Structures are given as structure tokens and as C-alpha cells.
């Protein structure tokens, strides 16, 4: 209770004492090894070996634990690579350091140590310190679950599992780039500020550029710009960056999230299906050591093909009582839709209602890797029409763990059709659809110059990271998730 | 004049004819080679060799040029890797293709070809087509300088030099990551939407999050979040992403630009100076093949140390007539400042005026790689104070080609000092400084838990790319620069 305030008072008083002595906050100590390096290299050597090698190293980190036993102590130092034990002895350090300094320090304090490696009777790798310094005084003692999000640094200091989650996220992004580049893809960068937002359907964030007295939009998707690059000649491009959607927070929704969009000319959605399967198998194998991944109560085998269902087969499979003929009739579909809780807006058509039904009915049950094809043209304004049935498109979305992970399709490279579809989106917007697309004249012009047959894929990176770190809330894979006021 | 509209009419009419025949826009052709691959591998083989090897390949791209000579033609195909010549002959292709299809195509059209490699009497690598298809009909013929920016796809189709500029940008970013990772740095991702913007001084873009009825800011810098990660334990992190500043457009300013911020604990600004020099020498050598880089009328040798000057030495060197004692006196400095065109605001102090003078006086003359040290504390609220003189900080900025490229310093890990400095920024904001920092309580708290001595660096990526692609306007290295309405 009050013992905490005594901790705050004592650390502050110790700091004041540091200031009277000299520079309380130096920046002079330099280390040459991190704990993980020392371990990877010397964990297999016995004390006899280490005695002869007589390796002196320098490390620095946070004092996590400390057991003072008179003239000698044991300290656990935590750094970027993990933890390493220090053997701090009064007679090994310069006169007075052990008693006048070391013993006056506190857990949480950042310290630097230089000394010889050896192993304790316990067999643990440790450093016999010949030099020890206080680099940074911690004014606060070492540390619902929203606290972990409101002060991620504390979450990272305290929980090894949180740290590993984020290190795996980095390993995954690096592996994705290596994977993409090995396939001749080039990473580009398009605008995050757009005069005309597009490439998806969502409520956007609006801002104002003072210099140009112009209203701008945070991008909801880089699609329209990436395909312009394909027209220009960069036939294998990809971008990995944020998208911003003015929607609410959820266990699978952050208003700003990371997405990877890729485009490859002379390919169709089938080529995206193989690329996607190959990417997951690679990430699992390369990052987790195996293709069988445990996620909650399930196990995904990324060494096996994903399941493939059409949107209608998915509705029928997860709501078997459904009279499928209902979906081929607006009045019947509207009724079906509303009967399950969907508020059918007046701008919606058959294809939109069916997609909404699929979302409500099947989405959550797609636990094992699954591709859902045959997305209606009405909800896919930028996708290539199906050769046989124009009302559906060469589009698919894939799901894992009951969540939408990606969205990919054979791109629409028919400028006249693109214009019409943009017009329909504009009519819809005028009819109430506040998420409908804006008409983009320049995009249509780019298409008029000629876009090669192309296939594009969009994968939610945050959601994909959940599946590889066994996280069940997107907030567990985003360092600083959007917090409610 | 009207011949252009005849081109538009003719392509549109040819398309209509395509639609009557079947699917005007197929997505079925697949290639197995890009021009650069064919060249890298077969440019050194003579026709006798290629005759025996009898290599059949498949390519696809834009028809750039075409010379029809009766029953045979020569075509130049442009793809992601460059150009390759095709030898299209009536008797090599299936009956009627050459005459009924090929000859009716137009430049700009996207085509696919399959055939055997060989070399022309000219010695150029070419493909003897056995199959040729029209993949995408171009409805528009092949293509101030703002047009290149308003329709970058045309700029990319037309100019090989623009394409190479962007390919080098990608090569550079990839090399930076490889460089950072080899040094144990981990790439993270912090928020682009912030409730309290900070980490720099600039007018920010403001937006509104509907769900939380909250006003948000596009980030001007990721600094405050990256250092929180250092407190948490990620001692070697970096981020490469956009920053948004609500300022005007210039030859060195885009309202949204790419920046790389890196932080390494147990290091000071000197370590950043070596890292910076090492990074440029590496990029030049690895990406351009040499450390001597030509930029306009100059040559930068990245194999040689950068120049180092204090902010005051730079002012004296580029305005020798200046009585330096003036800079140590507010009234005299204000006068000096105003006499050279600087409007001194009422919230400014000596350190701010001096920095402004440096900007006006020396900045533009720093052509060769130069580090400018001793930035005043007043304009560096997050930098470590100088041990000897508290009024200046362990901060530097480096310039090349007369432009600021980077900004780095020994981080301020003194929470009490950080709070005071934030308070001063708040007073300044209240005194008119619309670019002053916001007070961030949580950031100070993070510091209270303890930030290790650290060094952080911020490099403007767009500006750095200019120096490596001989570009003299930032708009030449950003695929889609901010265009005036
Ligand atoms: N708010 C958000 N937070 C995180 N990822 C998101 C997101 N909104 C969309 N995504 C991701 O972007 C991908 C492509 O965007 P899309 O337009 O398909 O989103 P969506 O609205 O269908 C996702 P959901 O169906 O879960 O609401 C999604 O498959 C998902 O991976
Ligand atoms: N509008 C802009 N466009 C492009 N790069 C920019 C930029 N504003 C700043 N930068 C880059 O970010 C770096 C760090 O930000 P900083 O706060 O130092 O900018 P600044 O305002 O000093 C740049 P200048 O002095 O050219 O106006 C700069 O050194 C520069 O490389
Ligand atoms: N832009 C899409 C992802 C890529 C679609 C394929 N071209 C989205 O945000 O859903
Ligand atoms: N945040 C700084 C760059 C890094 C400064 C070093 N900590 C800027 O925008 O200028
Ligand atoms: Mg959504
Ligand atoms: Mg969805
Ligand atoms: Mg979707
Ligand atoms: Mg500026
Ligand atoms: Mg400046
Ligand atoms: Mg600056």
C-alpha cells in the first residue's frame, strides 16, 4: 500500500544523491555481448573449458533479481537477448563499489557489467564481475489486461511471452519479404494520404492539408496505386504497410492495421491460392520449425492444402436448413437475411445480401485454413468478372481460426467495365452506402493505357501473426493497440 | 491533333470487335521468363550455341515498337525486366494469327509470346515466335514535368531512367534492412495515429475517430513509441515508415515522407556517426558498385569520413563577417537573425534564434557529407544534455547536397528533465509556438521505469534516395508525390 510510495520516495532520494555526485545519467558504458549470444556460444562448455578460455565479456541490462549474501551476490540481468547471471563479489570489484554502490542499487536499475565467464555449481552460465556500473536509475519498481496495452513497456519487461510474440512478428515480416523477393517481387511505397480513397469499402479517416486548403483521406487500401504501377511496368510489386479504417475496435479489428498487398501480372487467382499456401507453409516451417501449428484448441497443418468452398457452399454447410433457392431471389434473400439479424439497407442488392448472410452464417466456423470463392460482383467492384457468370467474380477470401485473413482476386483490367462499376458504387453511395467507393477518373485512364492480366492479394498481417503466436486478440500482436479513451 | 482522337476511336472499335469474338480480356497466358533473365543468361551465347540448345521460352509485356516487313516483323516487348525482341513470322504462327490478329494490334497492347531463342544478324537476342497472343488491348496510344507525377504510370512506361530510379530505391531499402538486421536491429511497427503527437516539431494532420468520438493526429515521428520499446527491452530497434507533416510542398518536402528511426542502447551519438558513415559507404558500394557518387556537379566519396562542424563553426564559416559574440546575446542575435530575413517569434530564445540563423546561413552550403553538432537544448527537447554545457545537447544533424538528411542524438533518459522540457514546450505553445510539443505523461512514466543510455537516429529516406539516383527534387524519388489541386 504505502510501501509503494516508500519505494518511489527512496528511488527519487537515491537519484538526488546521484546528481550531487556527478552525472546521474551517463552514456559511456559499452557492452560487447548480449545474453543470448553468451548462451548460444558457452552453454555447452563445462567450467574446466571456460576456466582455460578465460573469456572476458561486457554486458548491460535491467537488474531483474538479486540475492545478496554478505560479501557476494547473484544477480539476474535482463537484456534484449534474455537473461544472464552475474556473480558480484566485494573483492572482485574496485574498492567500495560493492558496498558503497552496488548494494544501494534497486531492482529495475539498468546496469553494466564486465567480467569473466564461468559456470555455477548449478551449471548456469554466469559472469564473474570485475567491473560493475549503474547506468540508469529506475525511479519506479519493476512491474485488467488493458494495462498491458496501456503500458506495453511494462508488459514487455515483465512477460517473456509478450516479448517473444513481438520477436516472432518481426521474424515473420522478414521472412515474408525474403519470400516475396525470392519470387521476383519488388517492394514499393504508395501514398497513405489520398484525395480519393479507394481499393476497398470502409468509412475513412478524413484530414485537412493546410498548405493546399484541401481535404485528404487516410488510405483504406493501396490497391488503386499498386495497379497503376503494374500498368507502368512493375509487374511483380508488393507493399507492406498500414491501412486506416474509421471503424470500431474489436478482437480482430484495430482502426489502423498492417496489410500486405501484392500483384503479379500474367497470373490469376489460382496462382494466388498456391502462393498463399506456399507462404504459410514456409512461414510455419521457417519460423516455427514445423508445419503443424497449435492455435487454441486446434492444430493447423500448413503442410496440407487449404479447404476450398464457394460462398454458397459455405452458407449451406453451416446453415444446412437453408433453402438455397432463397439466395437466387431478392425478396426471399432479404427475408432470410433479416431473419438472422442482418439489417438490409436499401442500396443492397442480391449479391450484397448473400455476402452478408455468408458473413453471419459461415465465417466464424471456418477454423481450418479455407478459401471461399465466387464473391458476387456487387461487392467486388475491382475484381475480374467470371467468364461464365458475370454476376460473380474471380475473387476469394481465405479464413483461418474463424477470421478473414486474406482477400485476393484476378484483377479487373477492363476500363469500361471498371468505370461502370465505379458508377454503380457512386449511385449506391448516393443511395445511402456510406462505405461505397469514389469514382476515380485517373484510375480508369490508367486502365485505358492497359493493365496486363493480373492477380492481387491482400493479407491482414496482424491477423496472420495471431495464428503464429497463438494470440486470440489482435491487441496481443500490435505493440500499441488503439486504446479507448 | 485529330489523329489522336482517331487513335482513340480505332482502339475502342477494335475492342468492340474483341468483345464480339469472346472474352476481350483473358487471364490465361503464363510466361516463364522476363527479358532481363533471358539477357543475363543468353546475351553471351552465339547463334550456333543457341541453335543447338534450342531453348523455348514464354514472355509477356507491352508492345513498344514494331516493324512489319510483309510476311515477317520485328517487335520490341517491354516487361518488368526491360526489353526483348520478337521475330514474328506468318509461317511460324498458327494459320491466320499473323494476318488476322497480329497485324491488327497496336503499340501499347499487352502481348504474350512463346518461341525459340536465337540472335539476329544484328547480334541481338530475339525470340522466334511459335505462339503470339493479345492479352490486353490498350485503348490509349503509348505516351510540364508535373505530368510525370500526375500519371506516373506513363512516366514509368516511357522513361527507362524513371523506372531505374525506383528500382534503386527498392534496392536501397532492402540493403538498409539487411544492413540493420546484420547489426542485430529488429524492425518494429508503432502507431501512425496518435492521441498526443510528438518526437518532433511540426504542424500535424488532425483527424477524427468516430467510434471513440476522439480527435486523433497523424504521427509526425515514431520517436516516443520507439524509446518506450527500448525501456521494454528491445534495445536495438528501428522502423522505416511514413511521417506526416502538415507543411507545404517543396523540392525537398512532401507532406508525407518515409523515415527510418533506429535506437541502440548503450551507445551515444558518436556511435550514430560511425553507423551513418558505414551505412552510406555500404549502400554506395553495394548498390552503385562504387563509393564515389556523382550528384549534379559534385562527387561524394562515401569512402571518406564526413566533415564535422559545430553549429556555430558552420555559421562562422558560411557568413565570416558575423561577429560570433552576437550569438551569445539575445538582443544582438535577434537583430542578426532579423537582418537576414528571419521573423523572430516571441516564444523564441537564444538557442532557437541561433538554430534559425544556421538554417538560413549555412545549411545550403553543406554540399559534401557533413555532421553539424552542438544543437541547442531549446530546440532539442528529447536529446541528452551536454555534460559541460547544459544549454546544448549531444545532438547532430547531417547534410549532403545542401539538404538535411538525418537527425540523431544521445537520447534523454532523465525523466525529471524530460518533464521540465515538456513543460517548457507547453509554455511555448501557449506563447504562440504552434509547432511546440505536447506534454506526454505516459512517456515520462516510461522514463521513470528506466531507459538505458541510448542513441537514436532519424534519416529521411526520400532525401537519401535523391543522393543515390542523382535526383534534384524529392518528387523524382516518390512514386506518387503530393500534387497541388
Ligand atoms: N480493422 C481491421 N483490423 C485488422 N485487420 C483488418 C481490419 N479490416 C480489415 N482487415 C484485414 O484486411 C483484409 C482485407 O480487407 P477487407 O476489406 O477484406 O476487410 P474486411 O472488412 O472484410 C475484414 P472483417 O470481415 O473481419 O471485418 C481482411 O481480410 C483482414 O485481414
Ligand atoms: N516534409 C519533409 N519531406 C521529406 N523529408 C522530410 C520532411 N521533413 C523532414 N524530413 C526528413 O526528416 C528528417 C528529420 O526530421 P526533422 O524534424 O529534422 O525535419 P526538418 O524540418 O529539420 C527538415 P528541413 O530542415 O529540410 O525542413 C529530416 O532530416 C529530413 O531528412
Ligand atoms: N485492397 C483489398 C486487398 C487486395 C485485393 C486484391 N486486389 C482490400 O483492402 O480488401
Ligand atoms: N524523431 C526525430 C528523428 C530521430 C531523432 C533521434 N532520437 C525527428 O523527427 O527529427
Ligand atoms: Mg470490416
Ligand atoms: Mg469481410
Ligand atoms: Mg472483405
Ligand atoms: Mg520542416
Ligand atoms: Mg531543419
Ligand atoms: Mg531538424
Curated annotation (Swiss-Prot), chains A, B:
Its cofactor is Mg(2+). PROSITE patterns: AA_TRNA_LIGASE_II. InterPro entries: Aa-tRNA-synt_II (IPR004364), aa-tRNA-synth_II (IPR006195), aa-tRNA-synth_II/BPL/LPL (IPR045864), Lys-tRNA-ligase_II (IPR002313), Lys-tRNA-ligase_II_bac/euk (IPR034762), Lys-tRNA-ligase_II_N (IPR044136), Lys-tRNA-synth_II_C (IPR018149), NA-bd_OB-fold (IPR012340). Mg(2+) 2 binds at residue 404. Mg(2+) 1 binds at residues 397, 404. GO terms for biological process: cellular response to heat; lysyl-tRNA aminoacylation; RNA capping; tRNA aminoacylation for protein translation. Its main location: cytoplasm. There are two lysyl-tRNA ligases in E.coli: lysS is expressed constitutively, while lysU is heat inducible. Can also synthesize a number of adenyl dinucleotides (in particular AppppA). These dinucleotides have been proposed to act as modulators of the heat-shock response and stress response. This is Lysine--tRNA ligase, heat inducible. It comes from Escherichia coli (strain K12). The gene is lysU.
Amino acid at each position: 500500500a504505502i510501501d509503494f510510495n516508500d519505494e518511489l520516495r527512496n528511488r527519487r532520494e537515491k537519484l538526488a544523491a546521484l546528481r550531487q555526485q556527478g552525472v546521474a545519467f551517463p552514456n559511456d558504458f559499452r557492452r560487447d555481448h548480449t545474453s543470448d549470444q553468451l548462451h548460444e556460444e558457452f552453454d555447452a562448455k563445462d567450467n574446466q573449458e571456460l576456466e582455460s578460455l578465460n573469456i572476458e565479456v561486457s554486458v548491460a541490462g535491467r537488474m531483474m533479481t538479486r540475492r545478496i549474501m554478505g560479501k557476494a551476490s547473484f544477480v539476474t540481468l535482463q537484456d534484449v537477448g534474455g537473461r544472464i547471471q552475474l556473480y558480484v563479489a566485494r573483492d572482485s570489484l574496485p574498492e567500495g563499489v560493492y558496498n558503497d554502490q552496488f548494494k544501494k542499487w534497486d531492482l529495475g536499475d539498468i546496469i553494466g557489467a564486465r567480467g569473466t565467464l564461468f559456470k555455477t555449481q548449478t551449471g548456469e552460465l554466469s559472469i564473474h564481475c570485475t567491473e560493475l556500473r549503474l547506468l540508469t536509475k529506475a525511479l519506479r519498481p519493476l512491474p485488467d489486461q488493458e494495462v498491458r496495452y496501456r503500458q506495453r513497456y511494462l508488459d514487455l519487461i515483465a512477460n517473456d511471452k509478450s516479448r517473444q510474440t513481438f520477436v516472432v512478428r518481426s521474424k515473420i515480416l522478414a521472412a515474408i519479404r525474403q519470400f516475396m523477393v525470392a519470387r521476383g517481387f519488388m517492394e514499393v511505397e504508395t501514398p497513405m494520404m489520398q484525395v480519393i480513397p479507394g481499393g476497398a469499402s470502409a468509412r475513412p479517416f478524413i484530414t485537412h492539408h493546410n498548405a493546399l486548403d484541401l481535404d485528404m483521406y487516410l488510405r483504406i487500401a493501396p490497391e488503386l496505386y499498386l495497379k497503376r504501377l503494374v500498368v507502368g511496368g512493375f509487374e511483380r510489386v508488393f507493399e507492406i504497410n498500414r491501412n486506416f479504417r474509421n471503424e470500431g475496435i474489436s478482437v480482430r479489428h484495430n482502426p489502423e492495421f498492417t496489410m500486405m498487398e501484392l500483384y503479379m501480372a500474367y497470373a490469376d487467382y489460382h496462382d494466388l491460392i498456391e502462393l498463399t499456401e506456399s507462404l504459410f507453409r514456409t512461414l510455419a516451417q521457417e519460423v516455427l520449425g514445423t508445419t503443424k501449428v497449435t492455435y487454441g484448441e486446434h492444430v493447423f497443418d500448413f503442410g496440407k492444402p487449404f479447404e476450398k468452398l464457394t460462398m454458397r457452399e459455405a452458407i449451406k454447410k453451416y446453415r444446412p436448413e437453408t433453402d438455397m433457392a432463397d439466395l437466387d431471389n431478392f425478396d426471399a434473400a432479404k427475408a432470410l437475411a433479416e431473419s438472422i439479424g442482418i439489417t438490409v439497407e436499401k442500396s443492397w442488392g442480391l449479391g450484397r445480401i448473400v455476402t452478408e448472410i455468408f458473413d453471419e452464417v459461415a465465417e466464424a466456423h471456418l477454423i481450418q485454413p479455407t478459401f471461399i470463392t465466387e464473391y458476387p460482383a456487387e461487392v467486388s467492384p475491382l475484381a475480374r468478372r467470371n467468364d461464365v457468370n458475370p454476376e460473380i467474380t474471380d475473387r476469394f477470401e481465405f479464413f483461418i481460426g474463424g477470421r478473414e485473413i486474406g482477400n485476393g482476386f484476378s484483377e479487373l483490367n477492363d476500363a469500361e467495365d471498371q468505370a461502370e462499376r465505379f458508377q454503380e458504387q457512386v449511385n449506391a453511395k448516393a443511395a445511402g452506402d456510406d462505405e461505397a467507393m469514389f469514382y476515380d477518373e485517373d484510375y480508369v485512364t490508367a486502365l485505358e493505357y492497359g493493365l496486363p492480366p493480373t492477380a492481387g492479394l491482400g493479407i491482414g498481417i496482424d491477423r496472420m501473426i495471431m495464428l503464429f503466436t497463438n494470440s486470440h486478440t489482435i491487441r496481443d500482436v500490435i505493440l500499441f493497440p488503439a486504446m479507448r479513451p
